[model samples]
Every structure is written in C-alpha cells, then in structure tokens.
Target: ADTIVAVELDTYPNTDIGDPSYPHIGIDIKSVRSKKTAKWNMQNGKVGTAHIIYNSVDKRLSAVVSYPNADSATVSYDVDLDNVLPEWVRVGLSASTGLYKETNTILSWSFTSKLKSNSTHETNALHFMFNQFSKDQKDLILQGDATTGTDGNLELTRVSSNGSPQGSSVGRALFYAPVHIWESSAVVASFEATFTFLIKSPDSHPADGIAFFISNIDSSIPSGSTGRLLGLFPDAN
Candidate 1:
C-alpha cells in the first residue's frame, strides 16, 4: 500500500485524541494516531539530535532524541517492515505547525542501512486480515447502510422483521488507505488477493452476491443501483 511511517517529535498536546500533556516522541505506522510514545521534553531553541533505528534481527523500531546537556528519551515498538512496506523504499522528513503559527527547521540529517541480497525478486507486498471491523473503525470507511455489528462482523444490509426491502439495501466497507499496485504506466506489480465471506440469506434463495473489486480512488456507489447490481453498476433506468 501507499503508506507513510513516521517518527514524530510531537510538542503540542492534541487533547482530542488524548496526547500526553508534555512533549513526547512517537512512532506512527499509518494513521495519525501513534502506537508508541515516550516523554521527551526539549529545551526551547536548543539543537537536538534524533536517532531512529530499526533492528531487523529483533523487528524493533526505536527512536532516541537528545540535547547536549538534557536527559534523552527513548521509545520503541515491535514492527516488521517486511509485512508493511516494500524492500526498495524512499526516506524523507516532514513537519507541521497545525493550526498555530510557528517555524520548523532542520539543520542536518543522515541515514544509512545494511542489506543482504538473496535474489533479484525482493519482497514487495501489503497483507492485512480483519476478523472484526468495529475496533478498526478508524482504518475503515463504511458507506450507505454498512455498519459493524457488536460481534465485529461487517453488516452490509440491515435485517428486518417487518419484511421491508432492507435486504436489498446497498452498502460498502473500504480500506482507508489505497494500495500501490503500479510502479509506472508500463511497469505493474504482480500480486494476489484472497477474500473469504459467509452468506447468511434472509431466505433460502439469495438474489445478490458479494463482490470484491479494485477501482480508481474516486469511484463510489452508483446511483439507484442495488439488488442484483451488487453496487458495481449504474441504474438501468
């Protein structure tokens, strides 16, 4: 997938999501929310050195920030890059001031890596499996009548005892991030996908079936398309 892994030196306390009151260092995988954080209070206008390291042997991603005379802060998380990102990748830096006005500067930075070549075909893939959708609601987009049940299953159509047309309702659950499937116009990355779903028909007969598709990011549910259409085509009328 087209993903961004960030090592954040967050100074502001965004209380909406419950960030630490003091300054902190964090590691964000894909979402803006961090999975790991450690208290790191830096002096005002002081030069600091940040060390970000990934130990492939132990699958640990760690960050250490330090000032000349201040105590340093270290934070780490266990993550395997092989499962989340491609072998050949790009590295860069970014910063933001949020709603407030401020200046963010970078003086100098360096990066290095060690690799052992096993073959010409390097690993390049994104693998994810969701058994329950509720807890992962932040990483998903539910449209129409699509909702996550208490049991964590993705419920596309609402069940009704009043015999309404709810069974024919249209809904969709999409991954929040888009997968990077192409390198260029001529170069296409070859990959495979597998999906398993259980059908619980309201009656013995089922009118429509589930569908898995890959479309442009702009694609959405068609107008007046439901029932046998499987939410993939426009209305006939």
Candidate 2:
C-alpha cells in the first residue's frame, strides 16, 4: 500500500510541470490535446506509453474544439511506464477501455524511449540495428514476414493492408538477440537501443501507430496473433 501511494503521488498536484527525477520530457512530434486521459502505464517491469493525434482537416464541432489553423501548439504530460522496478507490476492500456482506442476523430499512439541496464560486469551493451530486412535477419528471431528494403532500412510494414493478404494490417515482428551478463547487484542495469521505423499508407488517416518495447516476455508470438493484438500478444488472451 505504501509503495502504491508513492506511485500515485509521483504526479500529485498534477500540474504541467516536469519532475527532475524523470529528466526527459515528451518526444511528441506535434501539438497535443488533453492530459485528462493521458498517462503512461507500467507494471511488472513492462511499460506502455500512449497519446492522441487528431487532424484539423475534419472538425464536427462539439463540446470544446480548436483547429488552430493547423497549429494550437499544445503540450504533453510526464510519465514513464517502462520505469523498471524490483517488485511485480501491471501494464498497458486501460482496464475500462479494454484496449487502446482511436476513432476517426483521433489517432492512437504509443512510444519507447531510452532504458538503462548495468554494464559493470562487462558486456557494456548489445546493439541491434536493422537498416534493412534480409534473410540474414533469419539469424535473429523473427515472427512474421518482417521485410527489408534495398534502400537499406528495415521495413516492418507495407503500403497496403495485409500487403495484399500476403501480410496483415495488424502485422507485427519481434527481433531478439542476446545481451550478455551481470552476476549481481540490487540495481537494474542501464542500456540503450535505437530503431528507425516508417509508417506509410495511401489512406489519409492511417490504421495504427508504432510501439517500441523491451521485456522478459520477449519470445515467439503465438500463431495467428494479428489484428489489434499486433502479433505481440496472443489472440485468445
């Protein structure tokens, strides 16, 4: 109960201020709308960050709306769902919503940021950079038909839904490699990784966004893990 209270108070007085403890602020690309429904959720060492992006091209005019002529210049909130802890924790989306939500009125989003791991024992790090997809990637762990570009960048998705039924609108691919060793210490290690992803479709309001994650749950996704599950989680669950 004490720990939970501490967690709750981490953002008490809920102002637009950033905590010095959490040095980095939002990596948001454009203006944000509201903070009431915005928060990064974390549990059991797993983290989930989410936000919303709406296009000004359409405005139905409801309770309170502002297009700002393609510029309101709003800001984002502060939270780190991936903030690892020794104890177990819950993760991702909201219990009430049952899943991430985004209507045409808005576009749903998720994020990943710098993480830390102890490199003291040696093996300062494991760097995995996929500039393009290749059969060589088969050397690593791949779930679906994650593709590569001769342009030399890893293309996780395609220009069309299911890429013509050869793939899926909700396709997902996981890359796993070993980051060797640390024998001890109560401290969680600090590590860093980078990913370059591109989302493009002829459609105006794209289907979904991207999520960069790291976890102990890293492994082969169950068969038929598509749709909103994104091939990351099991369909039945």
Candidate 3:
C-alpha cells in the first residue's frame, strides 16, 4: 500500500495547489477524510490495480479498484474502533492524475491480519439493506430513478410504482460511500446513522419536508433539486 505524491484533482472549486482557497484555513474542523472520485484518471496514465481488505474483527475496511479494461470498483469502509489507532493505520495510494500530468498506476499492495466471519460489518458501520432489491444500491445514490425504495422502506418523494396520477414528485437517497473516521490525523469521531422511514398520507398533506443532511455531497442531487427545497440549494432558483 503505497502511492500518492500530490493531491490528484487539479482544480474546479480550486485546489491541487493553484488555490482558489482550497480547503484552506483548517479544513472543516480538521481532516474529515472523504474520497469517492472516479471516472478514470491517469488521463494519460490510466492503468490501475488496488485491493485492500481489513476486518480487524469486523471493523471492516474494504476497497477494490481494477481497471486495465474497466468496470471494477468496490468500496466498503466502517472503521471507528473507538476512534481508531491500533498503533497506526493510513495505508496508501493517492494518484496525481490531476495536475501532475499523466501518472496513475499502483499495481501492488498487500496486508492481512485476517478476520472475517461477517459479524455483519460493524465498526463505524453503514447498512442499507433494501431486503433484496440487491446492490445496484452501490453505497447508495438513487437520485431520481424514483429515488430509494428499491424495496426496503425508503421513498422520499417518488415511488408509488409509476402510475402516478400526480405531480411534484422528488426523492433522493445519497450516501455514495466515503467513510474513514480516524486512524489519526485531523480526527472525526463518534458514529451513528440510522434511517428507517415511512411517510405517507391518506390526505393529511405531506407535500414536502424530509431532510437529514451531513453533506460534502457525493451523489450529485442539485439540479431542479426536489420538493420543498428538500434537495437543498442547487443553484437555488
């Protein structure tokens, strides 16, 4: 596990050193790590291989990235282990395919202490078991394909199962994967995310209003937003 020299995502909101303010001035209460960026980078260097699996008795940190031909991406992370730091844990791989110009390849990494019985993956945990709609739930980012309720109790705005003799529908379920609480450095502690929802009406008027935001935004849910501004400021028209 070793790779990364410079931040790897040139700039847009400004970062990667050209500084449009970057995350400058003590980045959001200090280092709350999150990375879910991918659409193939290496721009000129595109060769990839990375596989990591950590289960320190089910603290469960998993990652698999393989693209020499494409379509292999897996991410699983749920480690808080009382806020982390066994002695240390930060593994590696960063990739400067952003502004360093053509450089991305990490074809080797291995580590194992061995632990897997599934204890149902509980460290800092994350679970969205829609019964059996089955993982297309890829960590979740169901922004308007009738958004969530692929079968397990979640349908914020849409999903009467398409026969909607109605309007003003909007639903979103974004949790696109990025959870690295702490092994040290910048620190982010304490964890709990429980969403068990059921909202309906015979005609009691539940037009809009359903929110639980812990955003740095991962699944892109801003255009036209959603009902009652529940989608939270997209360009806010």
Candidate 4:
C-alpha cells in the first residue's frame, strides 16, 4: 500500500504592504518510509543559492528565491518513500515565481514523481489552489479599500472548479501548464497535458496569445480575444 501525507506551507501574517517586499517561499516534500535515511537531489541543476526553510515541528520545507521578471524558475527534489528497502522513491520539479506587476510578484508550484529499483503502481499527483492578491487588493478583500490606488483591484483564479483555465479579467498576461507525470511497472507515461493563457491590453485589444511547451512539442492549447476567453470555448473557434 502507498503511504499518504499532507503538507502545508503558508506565509505569515498573510498580508503585506505594497512598499516593502519579501522573498519568495515554496514547499517541497518527499516520503521516506523504507529506506535507512532519505536523501533528495536537486534535479536538472536547477538548484540555486537560496534560503531553504525547514521546520521539524511544523513538518514543512521551503526554498526562497528571487526573480526579476514573469518567467518561471524550475527546481526539483528526490526522496525515498519505503521503510525497509529505502529503494522506492519519488522525484519532482517545481516551476514557480512569476511576475505580478513591474515589481510586484506571485509564485507557483508543480511536481512530478520518479521511482527506482523496480516497482509497480507508483503514482503521485499534486493539486494546489491559491489566491493571488495585490497588496492593496488583499487589504480591500479582507479589510475594504481604505487607501488610494486600491479600488480597481485584480483577482486571479487559476485551476478552476472543473480543472480548467481561469484568470483575472483585467489580467495583462496569464500562463498555465497542465502537467501529467506517472509511471507503471511496464511503461512510463509522461506528457504535457495542456498549456494555455492569455494577454489582454487595457484598451481591450489582444496583441498576441499562445501556448507552447519548453520541454516538449509546440502546440497552442486555445486562443481568443476579449471576454470570449471566459467561457468554455475560444471566440476564434
């Protein structure tokens, strides 16, 4: 039987002012049941010189990194999940830290699983949903906007109810990658599930929209302009 674990990582105070900024934080976990001791490797040379935060009391681990733009930073960790043999394990990469405004920022996390030493029915899936609010917007949602430049706030809702694409209506640019990574005794099935997002101008004109994989094939998930991207299908369809 496969062991199950629940891990949670959250920011303290959960509120920040638009002026002072903080470093990015993320949670990475691996199960070490069978092995004498579990060790993790930073995959793809993606590890950087960042602050790694771990708490034994809370059972939470995270890394704080910095980015200058909207691009995503990818990192990975590996661990053993078995108790006796310490052979079966999982490995994953997380692409996080995206640009918010000129200076504001948001973060993302993704994962994959890998097994060693011959095993069957080794599966792992990561599901994450969170809200990204502007400093002023968070205040407005939780405390009501009492300050300037906080009225026209933006809220982003990724990973919708049915596991579909969703974002802020006033979003200037959005990007999402649907990922699937799994392995069986006989075969290892991995594919880019779906990649889609949009770009909206303040004037209601869309300059360009696209969906492509950085590691795999080049394919556009779907493209549309205006509020048409809201519904199930694209307007251009």
Candidate 5:
C-alpha cells in the first residue's frame, strides 16, 4: 500500500470504511480505514482547531480537536513513519463533502515538524540537564505551582518561608521537544537524563512523592489529578 499518514476530521461515518457511525477525529495510517477514532459532536457554524502531534520516540501520532464551546476530542495511533513515508514528501490538505450539502471553510492552518535530516556520519544523541531554570523557560512547560526558585532550580511544589509546601496541589515540568527513543534502523536509542530534586516538609512524615515519567507529546494535566497523584490520574482512578 502507498504511504498515507493523516489526521482526519470526519463528519459522516461510512461503516464500509470502518467508521464508528458518528462524527469523529481519527488517525489514519496508509489506509482510509482509521486505526484509531474518537467520537465527536461538531457544533454547527463554529470554528474548530485540530492539534496534531507526532511523537517519533513512541511512534505515536495523536490528533486533538477543540471547538468554540470548549468541546474537544482526541484520537491517537502508533506507526513507524520511517517504514512508511519517504524522505521527501509533499504536505497539503484536502476535503470532500461527497453528496452531502455542507460547506467546509478553513480559517487557518499551520504545521510544525521537529524531524531533522539524518546525517550518516554525525552522531545522533541527546543530552539534557535542567540546571538553569530561568534560562530554560522557553524549552519547558511548568504547570500548576511549578516555578523557578530563587536559587535557579525547579520547584515542582512551591514551599513557603517556613519550609512548608502547599498541600493538595500538584505541579510538573515537561520538556518542549520530543526525545527520540527509537531510531530509523529499528534500533532503540539510548539516553540518559539527570536532574536535582529537593523536597521540603514542615511535618515529620512526608506524604507526597515525586515521579519521572515519559509520555505522549500531547499529554495534558488531567482534571482533579492533584495531591499525591502528581496529576497522573483522575479522582475516579
């Protein structure tokens, strides 16, 4: 099959092509039959924005779409782009209403790819150390109460003068770029990450803990996922 990797905003569901019988957002790899789908109810006359993120490390492509009324949906799939797409390819957008009477107006569009040209002889490596918090603001997303401390270190949970961090809160810092964990030759990329962590608690017993995790590029802070969970899980979970 010819390589065709795309994120689709589908309105009608043609079961023959593996649609889920509802308007959806899908991640399509090589075939129109979407490998993953998210049911969506698109609002009429409202503009929608779709954010597509492809994490080369995890080989996962995710599409998140949102509307004016704060309604959104996400769908993702894993595929090795190196095995499918060629080195040089054209990028464009196409739409069809098929026999339906509807207008598809595109307000704006933008694309960003961090995939650089591979160099045969050059060593492919990634070395990151979070020592300068203030200087690395552009390359990091500090969420919740996370901020740069007076000593230029990352403060995941802010502490007061008396050495007491706020309770029932959570924070995290995420690297902006996607780190490749796998290479084009079907080889796993080796990497090492080092950082300093400081914890302060006024009480004798420490209730909260910290974690280092690797996730999808489009990962977001889950609602009510605070406290001891470190924003990793919802309250129901």
Candidate 6:
C-alpha cells in the first residue's frame, strides 16, 4: 500500500502571455519560477501532471494544473494499467482574441479509449463550460451557430462590434474542463483528476482563464457558442 502526490506553484496578480503584456511560453519546464512550487512522484505505477497559464490579452493558454487544482492542490498519482495509451490521452485549449493583432483563437482536443481485458468502460469528454458569463462579457464558445452553418468556422465571438466601446472587460471566465477514465487494461499505472474555476468580475470585468485538451477524434463532434460555433468539422465549413 503506497500512493502519494503533491505539486505547488504560485503567482498572484495575474495577466499572462509574456512581456510587459503578451509573450508567454509557459511551462517549458526548467525549474519554474515567478511563484515557485513543485513536487512529483507515483513512479512505478505511472503518473502524469500538467499545469499551465498564459493569457496575454487573449492569446490564451490556461490550464491551471491538469486533473484539477483550486489554488494549488493535487495529491494522488498512483496507477498501473500496463503501459497506458488509450489513444495516448490528450487535452488542449487555446484562446486568442486578437493577440499578435489577429490570432482570434479557440482550440480544443480530447482522447481516451483503450481499456479492455478485464472489464469496465466509461469515456465521457467535453470542454468549454463558461461559468455563466460576466467578465465584462466578451462572450465566446464556438464551433458553429446560426442554427448551425456558413463557413464561419465554429465561432465564439465578442470583441465589440458597431455598438462601440471595447476594452477593459476581461473579467474572469475561463473554465477548461478535463476528465479522463480508462480503468485498466494495463497501462495507466497512476492517475488523478481535480478541477475548479469560478471567478466573477466586479472591478469592471474579471475572470478569463481555463484550458485542458486531449484528442484522437470522435466525441460526436458538434459543439458551439462563442461567436458562431467554432467547433467546425463538417468539412470545416
């Protein structure tokens, strides 16, 4: 009987991407500092962990520690599923609302399927769960919407248009949901999952951060919101 897990990293007063404001290459992994905290274990059994944060005025890349962590906390990495490769398991999310000038972004991914020898199967995947919306409100969650069509390329829009008055509404709204379950066919020797993000804004607009992705394709394919459903695949049009 042996299992343990712990990881830590901190940096308050957030606004990421790099530079004085935009230029981030978060998690290249070389000691990690700005707000340091690190710990890793769960060897023989197998283990995996990832925590990233990079939002330079949109050019987004937020995943405050994959598997979950509410202000630093994830302890439990011990599994042994033979090797682990149910499609390799992946998770990704990218956001860019005009960062380098025009990188209006939104990327997603999901993968998990490979556990059959004894029994047990349950693979549910989904991302982009906006808490309710109110970070100055530049709403986005796309993949197609207008009923659903017109080569807009799975949109999720809201950076001001015609109505005028834009900027200063980046109020917290980042929820990069992540969930994985492929209980043993002999590969995943260790595993752990935890997630939480709910930041509402009042000083005008607040929360804007969240990301997690893994892909091998086929999760039904048809997700929308953001600007006009940016989950395109039907020929990407």
Runs in model 4 lying further than 4 Å from the true structure: 1-118, 131-186, 191-198, 202-205, 210-212, 215-237
Q: What are the lDDT figures for the candidates, one per model?
A: 0.50, 0.27, 0.32, 0.22, 0.51, 0.24
Candidate numbers sorted by lDDT from highest down: 5, 1, 3, 2, 6, 4
lDDT by residue for model 1 (73-172), tens? 8888887665656544444333322122112223333444444334454534554555455644776566565556555555555534342224446666
* lDDT tens readout by residue for model 2, 1-237: 001100110111113433222211122211111222223211111112222222111311011111213221122334232232222221111000012211111112122222233444432333344434564656344335444435443434443232321224333344444332222431233322333322333332233233333333334433543333333334322
lDDT of 5 by residue, 114-188 (tens): 333355444444444443557357766666666655556555655565444556555666666665544565333
Error of 5 at 116 (Å): 4.0
Number of the candidate with higher TM-score, 5 or 6: 5
TM-scores for candidates 1 onward, in order:
0.49, 0.42, 0.23, 0.21, 0.49, 0.26
- Could you tell me which residue pairs clash in candidate 1? none
List candidate 3 stretches off by more than 4 Å: 1-54, 57-60, 66-68, 71-80, 84-146, 149-237
Clashing pairs in 3: 42-45
The candidate 2 region of ten consecutive residues with least summed lDDT is 1-10
Q: Is candidate 3 or candidate 6 better by lDDT?
A: 3
- The 10 consecutive residues of candidate 3 with the worst lDDT sum are 23-32
Q: What is the lDDT of residue 81 in candidate 2?
A: 26
Summarize candidate 3's per-residue lDDT along 1-237 as a digit string, tens digits.
111111112111233322233211111111112233222221122434444444444655444444467665454555544343332222221111111111111122222222222244433433332333333546555555333334433344443444231235544454555444333332223332222223323322223323333333233445554442334334312
Q: Of models 1 and 6, which has the larger lDDT? A: 1
Q: Which wins on lDDT, candidate 1 or candidate 2?
A: 1
Q: Is candidate 3 or candidate 4 better by lDDT?
A: 3
Count of clashing pairs, candidate 3? 1
lDDT of 2: 0.27
Q: Report the lDDT tens digits of candidate 4 across residue range 1-237.
A: 222211111111112211012222222121211111112221211212222332222323333332233243332223222211122222111111111111101222233322221346654343333233344433221111111122122222232233223332212221233323222331333211121111222222221111111111111212331232211112321
